[PDB]
């Protein structure tokens, strides 16, 4: 009873910032009741580090039989560097499945 | 794609040392990464499994208590301490990579313990 | 949760359609993996959940099957496929492998 249904991303596409907009990024990932569940992402910047962007606590809820895990990304302000693909990594040990998607940050006042 | 390994050898019984596998190739620290042993002529069995950032790890019962699994996400690399080993921990141990199926293996390493 | 494989060997030719069983004492849905294993040389995946190819893998291998009978096919025989081939389960905690199922060169 340790396996993984699906990693979603909400939004999934077409995200679109203009440059110092806040830049939210949630990561579902549906599991067994003794399923755990570990985050980690992959982004195209090297400003950041993952110890600012990703959250610290845990969002969990349970429903008959199914556990979701929820991990957001919260970035305070974009710039042309963050722009490319992000992935969300949620391995649970014996399992991993990553889903992609694509934000474009492009020169304009917010 | 490629998975490197390194470190096996010999051991006298309760003795350890430590088991590398490098990968390079592919984000290391995402993927959940596994230990799965083969002993000559068996078939293969599951050892341990760790996730991306070391926060769960399991163990079969033929190995809990005794070896210990590790990573370092920063050298990108797998390890696996082990101690206590006994005549019947000689096999042929491979690293390998978890999404959905052990999709990419390494080159395999043997590790003997006899008297 | 033990995989039984039938047969233990296969006896097969080149251009030869190949079938492997694999059974699971419980239901496991469609979380079966198969791999391929010649002599020396570690294992590679061939299928994942069942029916799904891998990346690189050519299409002569197939799989199907769900909840306790699996099997994989191979299409048509070539001097590449021959060698050992396990299945493996991936519902219950500890994912356990089949015995095995060796194709060797007829004679």
């Known amino acids: 009873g340790y396996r993984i249904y699906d990693v979603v991303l909400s939004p999934s596409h077409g995200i679109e910032l203009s440059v110092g907009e806040k830049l939210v990024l949630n990561c579902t990932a549906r599991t067994e009741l003794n399923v755990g569940i570990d985050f980690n992402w992959e982004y195209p910047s090297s400003k950041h580090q993952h110890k600012k962007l990703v959250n610290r606590d845990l969002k969990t809820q349970s429903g008959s039989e199914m556990k979701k895990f929820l991990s957001t990304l919260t970035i305070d302000g974009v710039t042309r560097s963050d722009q490319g693909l992000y992935t969300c990594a949620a391995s649970s040990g014996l399992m991993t499945k990553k889903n992609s998607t694509f934000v474009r940050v492009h020169e304009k006042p917010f | 794609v490629q998975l490197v390994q390194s470190g096996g050898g010999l051991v006298k019984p309760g003795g350890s040392l430590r088991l590398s596998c490098a990968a390079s190739?592919?984000?290391?620290?995402?993927?959940?990464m596994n230990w799965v042993r083969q002993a000559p002529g068996k078939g293969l069995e599951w050892v341990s499994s760790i996730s991306s950032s070391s926060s769960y790890i399991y163990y079969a019962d033929s190995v809990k208590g005794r070896f210990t699994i590790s990573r370092d996400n920063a050298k990108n690399s797998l390890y696996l301490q082990m101690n206590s080993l006994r005549a019947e921990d000689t096999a042929v141990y491979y690293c390998?990579?978890?999404?959905?199926?052990?999709?990419?293996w390494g080159q395999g390493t043997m590790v003997t313990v006899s008297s | 949760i033990q995989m039984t494989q039938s047969p233990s060997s296969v006896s097969a030719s080149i251009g030869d359609r190949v079938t492997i069983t694999c059974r699971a004492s419980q239901g496991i849905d469609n979380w079966l993996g198969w791999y391929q294993q010649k002599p020396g040389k570690a294992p590679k995946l061939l299928i994942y959940?069942?029916?799904n190819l891998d990346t690189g893998v050519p299409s002569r291998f197939s799989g199907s099957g769900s909840g306790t009978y699996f099997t994989l096919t191979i299409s048509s025989l070539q001097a590449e496929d021959f060698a050992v081939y396990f299945c493996?389960?991936?519902?219950?905690?500890?994912?356990?492998f089949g015995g095995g199922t060796k194709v060797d060169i007829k004679r």
């Open positions: 390998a990579r978890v999404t959905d199926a052990f999709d990419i």
């Open positions: 493996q389960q991936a519902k219950a905690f500890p994912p356990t």
């Open positions: 959940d069942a029916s």
């Open positions: 190739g592919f984000t290391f620290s995402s993927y959940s």
